[PDB]
Amino acid sequence: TFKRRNGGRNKHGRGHVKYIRCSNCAKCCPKDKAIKRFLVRNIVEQAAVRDVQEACVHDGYVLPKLYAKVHHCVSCAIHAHIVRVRSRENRRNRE
Amino acid sequence: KWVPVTKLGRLVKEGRFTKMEEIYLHSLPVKEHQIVETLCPGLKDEVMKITPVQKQTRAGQRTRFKAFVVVGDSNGHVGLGVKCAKEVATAIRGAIILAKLSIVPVRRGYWGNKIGLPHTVPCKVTGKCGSVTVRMVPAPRGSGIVAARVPKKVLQFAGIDDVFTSSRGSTKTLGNFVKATFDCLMKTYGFLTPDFWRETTFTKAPYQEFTDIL
Amino acid sequence: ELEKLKHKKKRLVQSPNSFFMDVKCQGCFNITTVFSHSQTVVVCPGCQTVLCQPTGGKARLTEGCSFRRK
Amino acid sequence: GRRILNDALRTMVNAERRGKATAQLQPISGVMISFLNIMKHRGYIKNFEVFDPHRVGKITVELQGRIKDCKALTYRQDLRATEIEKYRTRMLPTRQWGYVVVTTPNGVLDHEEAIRQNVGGQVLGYFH
Amino acid sequence: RALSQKEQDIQMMLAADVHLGTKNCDFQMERYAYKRRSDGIYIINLGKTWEKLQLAARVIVAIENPQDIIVQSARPYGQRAVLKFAQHTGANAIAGRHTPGTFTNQMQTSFSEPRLLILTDPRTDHQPIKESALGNIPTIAFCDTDSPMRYVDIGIPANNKGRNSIGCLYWLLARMVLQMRGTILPGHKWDVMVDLFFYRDP
Amino acid sequence: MQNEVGDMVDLYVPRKCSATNRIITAKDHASVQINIGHVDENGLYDGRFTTFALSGFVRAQGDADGSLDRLWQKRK
Amino acid sequence: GRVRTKTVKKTSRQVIEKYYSRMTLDFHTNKKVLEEVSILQSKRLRNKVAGFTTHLMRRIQRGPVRGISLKLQEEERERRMDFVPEKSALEVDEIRVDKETMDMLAFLGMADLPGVERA
RNA sequence: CUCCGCCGGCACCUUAUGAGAAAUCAAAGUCUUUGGGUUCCGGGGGGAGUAUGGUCGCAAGGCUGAAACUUAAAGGAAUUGA
Numbered sequence: 004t005f006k007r008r009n010g011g012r013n014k015h016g017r018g019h020v021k022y023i024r025c026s027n028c029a030k031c032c033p034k035d036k037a038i039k040r041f042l043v044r045n046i047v048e049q050a051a052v053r054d055v056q057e058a059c060v061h062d063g064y065v066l067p068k069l070y071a072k073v074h075h076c077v078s079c080a081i082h083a084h085i086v087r088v089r090s091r092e093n094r095r096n097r098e
Numbered sequence: 099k100w101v102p103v104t105k106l107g108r109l110v111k112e113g114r115f116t117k118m119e120e121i122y123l124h125s126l127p128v129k130e131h132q133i134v135e136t137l138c139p140g141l142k143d144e145v146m147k148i149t150p151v152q153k154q155t156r157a158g159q160r161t162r163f164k165a166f167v168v169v170g171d172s173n174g175h176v177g178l179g180v181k182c183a184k185e186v187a188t189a190i191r192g193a194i195i196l197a198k199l200s201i202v203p204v205r206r207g208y209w210g211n212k213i214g215l216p217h218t219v220p221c222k223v224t225g226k227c228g229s230v231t232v233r234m235v236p237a238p239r240g241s242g243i244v245a246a247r248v249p250k251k252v253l254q255f256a257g258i259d260d261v262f263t264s265s266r267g268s269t270k271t272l273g274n275f276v277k278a279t280f281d282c283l284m285k286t287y288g289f290l291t292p293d294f295w296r297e298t299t300f301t302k303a304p305y306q307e308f309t310d311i312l
Numbered sequence: 313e314l315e316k317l318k319h320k321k322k323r324l325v326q327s328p329n330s331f332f333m334d335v336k337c338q339g340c341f342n343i344t345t346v347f348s349h350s351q352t353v354v355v356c357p358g359c360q361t362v363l364c365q366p367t368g369g370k371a372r373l374t375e376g377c378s379f380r381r382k
Numbered sequence: 383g384r385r386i387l388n389d390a391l392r393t394m395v396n397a398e399r400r401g402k403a404t405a406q407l408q409p410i411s412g413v414m415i416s417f418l419n420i421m422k423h424r425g426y427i428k429n430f431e432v433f434d435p436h437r438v439g440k441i442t443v444e445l446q447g448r449i450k451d452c453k454a455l456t457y458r459q460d461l462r463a464t465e466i467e468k469y470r471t472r473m474l475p476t477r478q479w480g481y482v483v484v485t486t487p488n489g490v491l492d493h494e495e496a497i498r499q500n501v502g503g504q505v506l507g508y509f510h
Numbered sequence: 511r512a513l514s515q516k517e518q519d520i521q522m523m524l525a526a527d528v529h530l531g532t533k534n535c536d537f538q539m540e541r542y543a544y545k546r547r548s549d550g551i552y553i554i555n556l557g558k559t560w561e562k563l564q565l566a567a568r569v570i571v572a573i574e575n576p577q578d579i580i581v582q583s584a585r586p587y588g589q590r591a592v593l594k595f596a597q598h599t600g601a602n603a604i605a606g607r608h609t610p611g612t613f614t615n616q617m618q619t620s621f622s623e624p625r626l627l628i629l630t631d632p633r634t635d636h637q638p639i640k641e642s643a644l645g646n647i648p649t650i651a652f653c654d655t656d657s658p659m660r661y662v663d664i665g666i667p668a669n670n671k672g673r674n675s676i677g678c679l680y681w682l683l684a685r686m687v688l689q690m691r692g693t694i695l696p697g698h699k700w701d702v703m704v705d706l707f708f709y710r711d712p
Numbered sequence: 713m714q715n716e717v718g719d720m721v722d723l724y725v726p727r728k729c730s731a732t733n734r735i736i737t738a739k740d741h742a743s744v745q746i747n748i749g750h751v752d753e754n755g756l757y758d759g760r761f762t763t764f765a766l767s768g769f770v771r772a773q774g775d776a777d778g779s780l781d782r783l784w785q786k787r788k
Numbered sequence: 789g790r791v792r793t794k795t796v797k798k799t800s801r802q803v804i805e806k807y808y809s810r811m812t813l814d815f816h817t818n819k820k821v822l823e824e825v826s827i828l829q830s831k832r833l834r835n836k837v838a839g840f841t842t843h844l845m846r847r848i849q850r851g852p853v854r855g856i857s858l859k860l861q862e863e864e865r866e867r868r869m870d871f872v873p874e875k876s877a878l879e880v881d882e883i884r885v886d887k888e889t890m891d892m893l894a895f896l897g898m899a900d901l902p903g904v905e906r907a
Numbered sequence: 908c909u910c911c912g913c914c915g916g917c918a919c920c921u922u923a924u925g926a927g928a929a930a931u932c933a934a935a936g937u938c939u940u941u942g943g944g945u946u947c948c949g950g951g952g953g954g955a956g957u958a959u960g961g962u963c964g965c966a967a968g969g970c971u972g973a974a975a976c977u978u979a980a981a982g983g984a985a986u987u988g989a
């Protein structure tokens with residue numbers, strides 16, 4: 004039995020893909036297999052943004068934003084619910 | 099009594115058919131089994147195997163019996179029925195119903211010399227169902243049916259007289275084995291023979307010929 | 313008819329996509345024959361200006377070089 | 383590599399089985415057209431073009447759907463006119479129809495022709 | 511001079527915007543689409559559309575009893591087209607949802623053995639397609655430039671997703687079948703006007 | 713077909729697809745038989761129709777429509 | 789925990805099919821309507837179905853409703869079904885299309901048409 | 908950069924009319940209607956890539972590689988249940 008068409012990693016036309024480190028357990032998994040999300044979070048959540056616009060010394064100042072491209076392995080992604088086990092049929096779609 | 103629900107059943111009830119040649123020639127879906135008794139009178143049915151299949155549930159494992167019946171008159175009509183049911187007898191009945199629904203036409207041929215009625219299959223035919231494949235090869239007059247007990251019991255209904263049988267795959271699984279035999283028969287009218295070469299003059303379908311009674 | 317978009321060697325009777333073109337410049341009112349896919353710079357014998365630049369496909373003409381297929 | 387008279391027949395089987403009206407053949411041969419002459423003589427394909435402009439060649443046959451299977455026996459056999467009799471049973475569907483085409487010193491010809499002219503040769507292929 | 515039935519009918523289809531297919535095409539019916547506009551949607555030879563319309567009309571008329579013909583439209587843009595088509599041609603329209611098993615389950619309440627099956631869309635009405643493939647049921651389907659036209663015997667190349675086109679095309683079939691059967695005697699006059707087939711939404 | 717006596721032994725010489733010439737077997741429930749009427753003059757119909765038959769193969773490909781078309785352009 | 793079962797809802801729709809002008813909004817009036825127009829075996833089921841039919845009233849009386857079919861509403865929906873404009877609203881006297889839609893007609897030989905114009 | 912077409916790539920999406928034990932595959936199709944050419948390679952599970960012999964390597968090891976005996980199943984795919 005073969006669980007997936009591409010094996011869980013998108014590797015065609017290559018022989019080796021440079022590995023990376025999980026952001027949680029530091030496991031070495033290939034860059035084309037790691038669950039890679041580009042999280043862009045506020046510095047503070049919206050219940051503490053009025054309170055910082057009431058403290059910025061210069062008016063018209065916009066809050067910076069944290070841009071960071073976190074990597075996870077499959078183990079940590081499943082465990083932290085980044086991704087979930089989907090049915091045999093729903094498994095295939097990429098949307 | 100009957101009160102047929104398919105208009106084929108209606109026409110058969112008023113008896114404006116005589117033999118299943120027209121229904122076969124027009125490839126119509128036969129949906130009421132009580133057409134075929136009135137259209138094929140000399141019909142004989144035998145069950146061969148009752149193999150019990152078992153689904154397993156929380157409480158235990160629940161058994162059903164499925165029946166493999168062959169029906170057919172010894173003149174080129176043979177039909178296979180498979181039916182799974184709780185009880186042996188009702189499995190037999192449902193199988194015989196589906197089998198008399200699955201009557202199909204088997205064409206015969208001569209080995210080399212066209213004297214007497216046709217006895218052997220027209221040519222080499224192959225039928226496959228799952229893993230088992232069966233071949234019938236034409237045989238000269240008076241060589242019998244060389245085949246296993248199952249396809250020989252199919253062919254003795256099909257009316258074939260002489261034939262050479264070569265089989266592949268797991269012939270022990272009687273379901274696939276008899277279904278491959280039947281698939282190898284019901285495709286003997288699938289062979290573009292030179293004898294068919296003359297282009298066909300069409301015939302009105304039963305619906306448009308017996309329209310006014312609909 | 314699609315037999316012109318269809319590949320060079322997949323047509324019914326395979327035929328070239330190229331042609332010989334007579335190029336005539338602005339500075340030297342004579343005619344010189346050049347090939348569609350020139351592969352080599354060619355210069356007018358008198359005026360010595362370039363007629364074409366080799367390219368992966370058809371050669372590139374210089375400004376004011378009128379050419380007739382032939 | 384190419385070992386045509388298979389590249390032609392397998393194209394013809396594929397075209398027929400898909401129901402295409404005409405099939406074209408990229409290389410040709412005197413042997414190829416002599417095979418198609420056997421088919422057309424025995425009434426299995428209708429007439430056809432032989433595009434011979436300048437090269438190996440090209441052909442276009444029109445299929446009438448009357449053919450059912452046609453093959454080449456590359457690994458071209460030796461074949462006596464005493465022992466075709468167990469090739470006809472070994473390959474052809476029955477003893478009434480189907481033809482085995484064997485090349486013989488009298489050119490390409492089918493096995494029934496080989497019975498009457500009593501000349502054997504090498505199997506080019508068959509069709510039925 | 512005068513006009514031909516060609517003239518009037520092609521004008522009617524230009525008006526009801528039938529010639530405009532969509533962005534895509536299927537190799538099966540690319541033979542009807544003629545050229546692309548640079549915006550990207552295809553357009554259909556309405557002459558070839560009307561040729562197929564005559565084909566379908568002859569097939570309809572060759573039916574002895576029109577009570578054995580079923581026409582379907584699952585798009586709500588076509589129910590008012592199909593019932594008006596049905597009451598005129600004597601056919602039997604099944605508008606709305608198609609209950610699966612209509613053509614096979616013999617002791618179903620909604621059973622029938624139609625001589626012929628007309629569909630506004632093979633794509634949406636693909637269920638009747640599949641049952642027709644099991645019931646020996648010839649089919650005339652209204653194929654757009656996106657129509658996956660498996661199991662279709664006669665396919666009219668036409669837009670079938672518009673407020674006007676579905677109403678127009680069934681009105682063409684209505685008039686043509688009625689001319690064929692002669693209920694409207696020779697003469698382009700017919701006492702039914704097209705905007706009736708357009709669906710009247712609340 | 714023909715017995716050597718001349719008697720005819722085989723039953724329902726089956727109809728053949730008009731577009732691909734493979735024969736419709738007795739259980740190709742994906743096979744259809746179109747009737748196309750003929751129109752003559754005032755009235756524009758009588759019970760004179762041409763008949764076509766198509767196997768499951770041709771329909772399943774989808775190219776059944778092209779077959780009906782290209783066989784309807786035959787004249788008489 | 790008060791959802792009505794099929795023995796309730798089927799009966800409510802079926803009785804509201806047949807008896808519309810003869811039953812009204814008021815719960816108790818519908819009770820006594822149902823007494824003479826149906827035979828049941830429990831006063832609580834009687835109350836149950838009457839109380840479902842009463843808001844079936846309160847929904848029908850303001851807007852349309854699913855399958856349940858009544859002549860006094862289907863006939864009017866047919867009367868507003870079958871109307872047409874005084875003349876066909878789509879007019880052929882002016883048709884505005886582009887070059888390829890004209891190529892249609894030109895390939896069909898029809899370079900000249902009534903009412904076809906260049907955009 | 909937009910559009911259309913050719914080749915040659917890496918792939919992907921839909922469908923059997925095909926194939927398959929199926930999973931699945933547009934190439935694992937054109938296979939009992941069996942034959943384009945060619946190399947390597949398997950013959951139930953163990954014992955075992957083990958012993959012995961050879962050979963290469965500094966060594967680890969690599970390549971080549973059995974038998975005795977034992978066993979009625981081992982195994983693949985999919986179904987239901989737990």
Ligand SMILES: [Mg+2]
Nearest residue numbers: 016017916917
């Ligand atoms: Mg590469």
Ligand SMILES: [Mg+2]
Nearest residue numbers: 017018019020
């Ligand atoms: Mg690697």
Ligand SMILES: [Mg+2]
Nearest residue numbers: 949950951952
């Ligand atoms: Mg072993």
Ligand SMILES: [Mg+2]
Nearest residue numbers: 004983984985
């Ligand atoms: Mg397993």
Ligand SMILES: [Zn+2]
Nearest residue numbers: 025028076079
């Ligand atoms: Zn991790």
